[PDB]
DNA sequence: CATTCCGATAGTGGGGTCGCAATTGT
DNA sequence: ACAATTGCGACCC
DNA sequence: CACTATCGGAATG
């Protein structure tokens, strides 16, 4: 309610104060994640009132600004994923889905783009002025990388054409072309520097640098592919049309973007790009096919993790060979026992591969895999290690059978492989230390209670030393007790207590998900949350009423019902609430 | 309607690099 | 008593 | 980030 001038000055005062403490204490940086935040808030208010900007304002920073801790930025519009298709048939299925859905909106035109291989970045432009830039994070909240993005030559600090909207969030890929990647490695080996493994991870590392001066020396570039929040302007209903407009604003846009009228045209485009792939000058992992019309785009809507109007049409992945040195079994929070191949380290498409999931016992039999076997490996989708097949012809004289454990490798309990099901799991329950660990690990994960600083190691030790038994115990911990832990310390322990405290404020959906109810993942957690609104109506629901919730049948209904039916869980929840955990009432 | 098909999730798995701070070295 | 290493978790794909 | 099993619900005969 306080006037503009009074708001500007209160932001500048806090900013100039942080800079003061920085110099005084002779600090290495500004440990306050609230310095980058305040700065973007000042920029947002300033671009809004270009006449209320002073030459003394921190926004007119004359030279290198003081280093500051990374802050976060919320995405009004989610930065989701893409459903993948790997072959012409997979695409035709996608095409059928889009068609069968739409009601005689017949004219479906496909906008086709290269799927660049770097990292996603969202850039907010207010009245044509670049105010902030953020990564994707969990889709809702991402890291503020404004300082690093400002050093990217290809990204204009201000747009220029006509009808520039009041608010325009530009989404695209930041990346290192091959020549830039090689230039950086040539410099690393010349000096004592460390060389990067590939351009994707090098580009990402560059944007996580605390000191922008270092980022400025990385020849990062950018390409627009979409839009986030949009307010004002006169943008067209065609996706291509919009990119064409961005290009006119001065934003960088790939000249390869094309329009296809049929599925055959899309396929032709796919093979065309596959052929010129080596002449691009940068890496790609495929092409993105999307409904060009923003209207139809809205009719198709999104699913949990991705739009229904687009797919990433990926290229086949580069294969390599190596051998299995061993197969280990890891226990998950729901008791699941997953086999993992330990491989002889081999380089594949830019990275060192040492491990690959084997999924389950059926997969191991399908492959006929034995310890010692030679295998064909590949980074599926150009990211994840996958064991394609065993090379029988080269099976060593001496190989060892892979024996699925009949007793959990942790608590020793019996393993259960239910009739007709493929998954085998540990039956120890609360007795199993691996389940306890994985469960607490899941409770603390980014899409759950999001407790920064709590990882596999700290959790392992807390469960090992019997300090924690249930989620509630996590908040009873004090700096004193944490300080005396392996790889733990005074400030380190304080950061955890702080993160735990901050984690108290959540949402019903995240809390529900954090509880780890069988078959209740993030999507179902949100559905149940939105349906009942309160933890009361939920645990008071019957199996028959639970089945009224969309996408919830008897399996889920029963698991949910049996979960709250247990006093055990009732007190875990009640204790968490007692501990302080809470969320916005509907 | 009984089966089969399929869209959408759940659950569990991988590697690179950087900042912070625990830990080791001068 | 700082300075240089390096374990761990964040957080990219 | 990818894969597979599984669940819920739509499609098939
Ligand atoms: O499945 P996923 O999470 O890897 O995919 C989402 C990411 O795909 C990238 N990308 C690259 N090119 C495009 C185009 N042209 N359109 C939409 N997305 C694109 C993004 O970086 C995104 O996060
Ligand atoms: Zn066990």
Q: Where are the domains of chain A?
A: 1-69, 70-77+119-253, 78-118+254-316, 317-390, 391-431, 432-505, 506-586
Instruction: Check if A116 has its Cβ closer than 6 Å to any atom of ligand 1.
Output: yes
CATH of A78-118+254-316, one of 3.40.50.11540, 3.30.1490.70, 3.40.50.2000, 3.40.640.10: 3.30.1490.70
Distance between CA atoms of residues A33 and A69, nearest Å: 5
Ligand 1 atom closest to the CA of A118, numbered from 1: 21
- From the CB of residue A74, how many other CB atoms can be counted at a distance below 10 Å? 9
Q: Which sequence positions of A are flagged as catalytic? A: 115
Instruction: Check if A226 has its Cβ closer than 6 Å to any atom of ligand 1.
Output: yes
CB A283 within 8 A of CB A350: no
A307: DSSP letter: B
> What is the CATH code for A70-77+119-253?
3.30.470.30
Pick the closest to residue A370 from A325, A420, A311, A418 (CA basis).
A325
Q: Measuring from atom 4 of ligand 1, which residue has the nearest CA? A: A81
Give A533 Cα–ligand 1 centroid separation in angstroms. 33
Instruction: Check if A81 has its Cβ closer than 6 Å to any atom of ligand 1.
Output: yes
Helix (H) or strand (E) holding A270: helix A263-276
CB of A520 nearer than 7 A to strand B = yes
Pick the closest to residue A463 from A495, A455, A426, A415 (CA basis).
A455
- Experimental structure resolution, Å: 2.3
Fold: same for A1-69 and A317-390: no
CB A523 within 8 A of CB A306: no
Experimental technique, in short, is: X-ray
* Domain A391-431 sits in CATH 2.40.30.10: no
Closest protein CA to C1' of nucleotide B20, residue: A492
Tell me how long chain A is.
Answer: 586
DSSP string, A126-146: ETTEEEEEE--TTSSEEEB-H
Pick the closest to residue A314 from A476, A114, A468 (CA basis).
A114
Q: For residue A101, what are the CA distances in angstroms to A86, A97, A308, A313?
A: 22, 6, 10, 20
Distance between CA atoms of residues A341 and A370, nearest Å: 10
The crossing angle, in degrees rounded to 10, of helices A263-276 and A88-101 is 140
* Domain A506-586 sits in CATH 1.10.1040.10: no
Nucleotide nearest to A67 (CA to C1'): B19
Give A481 Cα–ligand 2 centroid separation in angstroms. 27
Name which CATH class applies to A1-69: mainly alpha
Token pair for A327: 């197969």
Query: A492 by DSSP, 3-state: which?
Result: helix
The arrangement of secondary structure in A317-390, i.e. its CATH architecture, is: Beta Barrel (2.40)
Ligand closest to Cα of A306 equals 1
Query: What proportions of chain A, in percent to the nearest 5, are helix, strand and coil?
Result: 40, 25, 40
Query: A319 by DSSP, 3-state: which?
Result: strand
Distance between CA atoms of residues A227 and A231, nearest Å: 11
The CA R_g of chain A, rounded to the nearest whole Å, is 27
Strand B: which residues 68-127 of A lie within 7 A (CB)?
Answer: 69-70, 83, 93, 96-97
Beta strands in A162-220 (DSSP E): 167-175
Distance between CA atoms of residues A170 and A407, nearest Å: 53
Q: For residue A167, what are the CA distances in angstroms to A128, A164, A294?
A: 8, 8, 18
Name which CATH class applies to A432-505: mainly alpha
Mark A399-431 as b/e (b = at least 16 C-beta within 10 Å). beebeeeeebebbebebeeeeeeebbbbebeee
According to DSSP, the residues that pair with A516 across neighbouring strands are none
Distance between CA atoms of residues A525 and A94, nearest Å: 27
């Amino acid at each position: 309610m306080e006037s503009i001038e009074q708001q500007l000055t209160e932001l500048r005062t806090t900013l100039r104060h942080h800079e003061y403490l920085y110099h005084v204490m002779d600090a290495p940086e500004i440990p306050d994640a609230e310095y980058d935040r305040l700065m973007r808030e000042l920029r947002e208010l300033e671009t809004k009132h270009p006449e209320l900007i002073t030459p003394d304002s921190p926004t007119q920073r004359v030279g290198a600004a003081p280093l500051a801790a990374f802050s976060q930025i919320r995405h009004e519009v989610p930065m989701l994923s893409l459903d993948n298709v790997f072959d012409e048939e997979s695409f035709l299925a996608f095409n059928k889905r889009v068609q069968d859905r739409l009601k005689n909106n017949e004219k479906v035109t496909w906008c086709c783009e290269l799927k660049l291989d770097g990292l996603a970045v969202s850039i907010l432009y207010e009245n044509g002025v670049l105010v902030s830039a953020a990564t994707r994070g969990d889709g809702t909240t991402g890291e503020d990388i404004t300082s690093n993005v400002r050093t990217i030559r290809a990204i204009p600090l201000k747009l220029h054409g006509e009808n520039i909207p009041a608010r325009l969030e530009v989404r695209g890929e930041v990346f290192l072309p091959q020549a830039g990647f090689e230039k950086i490695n040539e410099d690393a080996r010349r000096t004592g520097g460390k060389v990067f493994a590939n351009p994707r991870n090098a580009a990402a590392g560059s944007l996580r640098q605390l000191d922008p001066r270092i980022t400025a020396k990385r020849p990062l570039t950018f390409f627009c592919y979409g839009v986030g929040v949009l307010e004002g302007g006169e943008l067209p209903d065609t996706h291509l049309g919009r990119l064409l407009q961005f290009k006119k604003w001065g934003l960088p846009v790939s000249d390869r973007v094309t329009l296809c009228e049929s599925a055959e045209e899309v396929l032709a485009f796919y093979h065309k790009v596959e052929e010129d792939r080596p002449t691009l000058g940068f890496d790609i992992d495929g092409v993105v096919i999307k409904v060009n019309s923003l209207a139809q785009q809205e009719q198709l809507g999104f699913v949990a993790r991705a739009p229904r109007w687009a797919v990433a049409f990926k290229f086949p992945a580069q294969e390599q060979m190596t051998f299995v040195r061993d197969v280990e079994f890891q226990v998950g929070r729901t008791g699941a026992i997953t086999p993992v191949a330990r491989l002889e380290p081999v380089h594949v498409a830019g990275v060192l591969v040492s491990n690959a999931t084997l999924h389950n016992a059926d997969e191991i039999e399908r492959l006929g895999l034995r310890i010692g076997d030679k295998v064909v490996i590949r980074r599926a989708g150009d990211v994840i290690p996958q064991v394609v097949n065993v090379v029988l012809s080269e099976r060593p004289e001496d190989t060892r059978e892979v024996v699925f454990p009949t007793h959990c490798p942790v608590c020793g309990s019996d393993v259960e492989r239910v009739e007709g099901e493929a998954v085998a799991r540990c039956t120890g329950g609360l007795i199993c230390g691996a389940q306890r660990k994985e469960s607490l690990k899941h409770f603390v994960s980014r899409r759950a209670m999001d407790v920064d600083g709590m990882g596999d190691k700290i959790i392992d030790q807390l469960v090992e030393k019997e300090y924690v038994h249930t989620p509630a115990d996590l908040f009873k911990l004090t700096a004193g007790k944490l300080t005396g832990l392996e790889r733990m310390g005074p400030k380190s322990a304080q950061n955890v207590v702080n993160a735990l405290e901050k984690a108290k404020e959540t949402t019903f959906a995240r809390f529900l998900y954090a509880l780890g109810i069988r078959e209740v993942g993030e999507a179902t957690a949100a559905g149940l949350a939105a349906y009942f609104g309160t933890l009361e109506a939920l645990e008071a629901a019957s199996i028959e009423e639970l089945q009224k919730v969309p996408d919830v049948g008897i399996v889920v209904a029963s698991h949910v019902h049996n979960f709250f039916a247990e006093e055990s869980n009732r007190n875990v929840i009640s204790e968490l609430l007692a501990e302080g955990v809470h969320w916005p009432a509907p």
